[PDB]
Structure formats: C-alpha cells, structure tokens
C-alpha cells in the first residue's frame, strides 16, 4: 500500500501545458482520483477515474492505466490559480481508506505583459535600521537565487495583481543588517536581465 | 454549506502535555475520517469511522494516540502526552457510503500543531514596514510598500494588509513560505515578506493610511512562563505607514 510520486517542485509558464504522476505496485488499487491542497488549505477534490481510461473536464485531463500501474494529471493552459500541490489518492474495493502520494507541488507562473526590471532602496519608517532593497517589475523567465552568505537575507519571487489597472508584476526582497550591504550588488548571484538604477 | 468544521486551527504548547483536536463533520455524513500530514511522511490516514463505530486504526500510533465519535456530529483525537515528533498539520475528513464510490471525501480546514522540546524558544514576531522608493514613483506611477516579519517561532503566522482601517488582498504578495533566519541551527527563528502596491497617487494621498499586521500563534492562559520576558503568547504586532506627498 504504498504510491511514488516526484514532489517537485515544479515550475511552468503560464499556458504551459503540465503532466503530474503517481505509479504504484499493489494491483489492488481499483480507483483513483486527483486532490487538489491549496497552501494552508485542506485537500480538494479535483478529478476521479474507474479502472482504465481518460476522463476529461475542461483543461484536465486525467488517465490511468492498470498494466502500467501508472496515473496522470495533464493540466493545457496551465493557469496561476492552478498553483498548488496534486495528490493522487488510491483504494480499492475491500475498504474505502484512501492512500495517497506525498503529492506535487506546482508554481505556474504569471505571465506579465510588460517586463521593466529594476531594483530600489527602500527606507526604513520611522527608525529601523537595515537596507532594504526591492527587486520588480522583471519577467517570470527570471530566477532568483539565494545570497552567498546567510547575513544577506533573500525572498523567491512573488507576483501582485492590482486588479483595478488589470496589470501585475513580480518582486523579491533581500534585506541585511550588514554595513557592506547595498543594493546594486544586492543579487549579484542571481542571473538577472541588463537593467539597474541607483539614487 | 457549511463544510467540515476542525478546533482549534493552530495548536502549540509544550511535550508532555494533553492535546485534545476537535472535528464536526458535514450534517448527514456518517463517515468521518483523520489524517495527518508532514513533509516527511506526507498525508496519511490515521483511522475513520462508521456510525461512530471505528473500521480501520491502522495508522494509528500507540496507545499515546487515541479517537472516538461519541455520537454521530462530533469527533475527537487525543494524544496523552504529546511530543516533538506527533506535530503535523490534522485534517479531518467526512462522507457519505455513495460519495465514498465515487471517492468523494470532504476535508476540513485542519489543526496545526507544533509540540515543542520547551517553550522558551518560543517568541513572537518583530514588525517593520519599509517605505517606497522615490525612483520607483518617478520611473512609474506606482508606489510599492513592503513589510517584514522577523524573529519569530514556531512558522505560525498570517501577515495582511490594512488600508485606512479595512484588509486589502489587490495588490498584494506574501512569501509562500516563512525562511530561516539561520539553516545551520537545527531549530530556527522565521522570517517573512510581503509587499503592497498602490498608485503613486494613492499613496501621495495624505489621508490614506497603510497598515501591516501579522497574526501570531503562540502560548496560551494555562501555559505555565518562569521567565523575565513579555510571555510569547498569541498575538497580533504590527507596523504601520501613512501617505506623503513631497
């Protein structure tokens, strides 16, 4: 009674078209079905399928397949609110306890139309004490790698939407308490496209 | 309706002590079911009932663990005492015999429960919120604020945003997940970010006010502190900003 599934996590673009899995070993396992867990949130169900075959709802798709003992989860037009972890959940006829795989965690991310990469100083409200420096406005092809040292405090990436201008955007923060620290040279380790600025 | 209800939603005290999770399954289901989840092991089934009867236990540990439905719209899951290794997020699950054919289970929000070696590392969270960038204002027409939650233990905590006194979500982003302010240690103190962004008009309002909160979960009344320090209890601390124009 045990399911193996890659946990991932894995990253896709917006409209991405996306294949999550599960195989077992127990030819007991009789139906399955796709749950969905948003973060901080208790499982959803999402698809179900009897023996072998595909069942389609919109832009899902779910199979299994008994020789194979295998079961997918393809999502077309991977959207941001898909964003989640996927277990596949098991049983079969004798009992109806669910088994279920560690599950898959997927981050599609948002596409934003118009790309102005930059990063800022912020300033501390009233009186703090440690540079903070914002990185925004770059594309989702961008990846944000951690600092060389633990003093150098580094955020992943994180889109907004504003919804009253139908426009969003992404953002990561890196903050230190150390002198040397300023940004510029803030994300000196992560790959970042041609633009800067400083005041 | 009104789904599957699970009390209480965080849960940290101290090992040695009795927790006691609570769930109310959906009206008319007469299947309810408990699960936990960890990273490690993942979401398993630890024992679900029939008409307050138990059917399967399997996943239940020893006697430390123990469950029952004294009737039909109410169950309960104990562990006496409790340690390090039981903390997990608790869901609780509830059905019908026709929804379970077609695999149709019904989960709660869960419990969280961290079961520490000692409170006293436990502490709350410290709360700045840093002011936008006059560049970013003149490079566009949007003004974005940030905050930063750090220092606190265990990850129990839900940061918002407030403006002029009501919770704002558009133009919102919080880290997913809190980051370590020190990987090495075993154990660690937390650290989280968010950002707001409004239109650089709206911020040069100087009537707006910008506010960041961030929902704490720590001791509680019973839980006993012998130490020369602002208890960590449950709380709420905050940092806040309002609008300029200069």
């Known amino acids: 009674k045990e399911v193996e599934q890659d946990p991932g996590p894995l990253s896709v673009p917006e409209g991405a078209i996306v294949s999550l899995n599960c195989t077992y070993s127990?030819?007991?396992?009789?139906?399955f079905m796709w749950y969905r867990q948003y973060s901080r949130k208790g499982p959803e169900l999402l698809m179900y399928?009897?023996?072998?075959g595909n069942k389609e709802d919109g832009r899902f798709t779910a199979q299994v397949d008994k020789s194979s003992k295998y079961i997918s989860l393809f999502i077309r037009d991977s959207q941001p609110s898909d964003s989640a972890t996927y277990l596949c959940?098991?049983?079969?006829?004798?009992?109806?306890?669910?088994?279920f795989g560690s599950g898959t965690r997927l981050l599609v991310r948002p596409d934003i139309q118009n790309p102005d990469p930059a990063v800022y100083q912020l300033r501390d409200s009233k009186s703090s004490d440690k540079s903070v420096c914002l990185f925004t406005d770059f594309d989702s092809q961008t990846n944000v790698s951690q600092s060389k040292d633990s003093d150098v405090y580094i955020t992943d990436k994180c889109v907004l939407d504003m919804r009253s201008m139908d426009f969003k955007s992404n953002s990561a923060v890196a903050w230190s308490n150390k002198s040397d620290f300023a940004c510029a040279n803030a994300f000196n380790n992560s790959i970042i496209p041609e633009d800067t600025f400083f005041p | 309706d009104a789904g599957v209800i699970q009390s209480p939603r965080h849960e940290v005290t101290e090992m040695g002590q009795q927790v006691t999770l609570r769930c109310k399954p959906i009206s008319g289901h007469d299947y309810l079911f408990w699960y936990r989840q960890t990273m490690m092991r993942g979401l398993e089934l630890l024992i679900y009932?029939?008409?307050?009867?138990?059917?399967?236990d399997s996943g239940m540990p020893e006697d430390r663990f123990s469950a029952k439905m004294p009737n039909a719209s109410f169950s309960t899951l104990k562990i006496q005492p409790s340690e390090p290794r039981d903390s997990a997020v608790y869901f609780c699950?509830?059905?019908?015999?026709?929804?379970?054919?077609?695999?149709?289970?019904?989960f709660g929000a869960g419990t969280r429960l961290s079961v520490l070696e000692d409170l006293k590392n436990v502490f709350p969270p410290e709360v700045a919120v840093f002011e936008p960038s006059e560049a970013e204002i003149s490079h566009t027409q949007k003004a974005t604020l940030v905050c930063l939650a750090t220092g606190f233990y265990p990850d129990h905590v839900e940061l918002s945003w407030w403006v002029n006194g009501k919770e704002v979500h558009s133009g919102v982003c919080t880290d997913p997940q809190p980051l370590k302010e020190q990987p090495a240690l075993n154990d660690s103190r937390y650290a989280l970010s968010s950002r707001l962004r409004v239109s650089a008009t709206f911020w040069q309002d100087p009537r707006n006010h910008f506010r960041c909160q961030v929902q704490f979960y720590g001791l509680s009344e019973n839980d006993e502190w012998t130490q020369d320090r602002a208890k960590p209890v449950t709380q709420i601390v905050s940092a806040e900003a309002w609008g300029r124009a200069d």
């Open positions: 699950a509830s059905s019908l015999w026709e929804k379970l054919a077609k695999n149709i289970q019904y």
């Open positions: 399928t009897y023996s072998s």
């Open positions: 959940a098991m049983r079969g006829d004798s009992s109806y306890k669910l088994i």
């Open positions: 009932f029939n008409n307050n009867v138990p059917i399967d």
């Open positions: 127990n030819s007991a396992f009789q139906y």
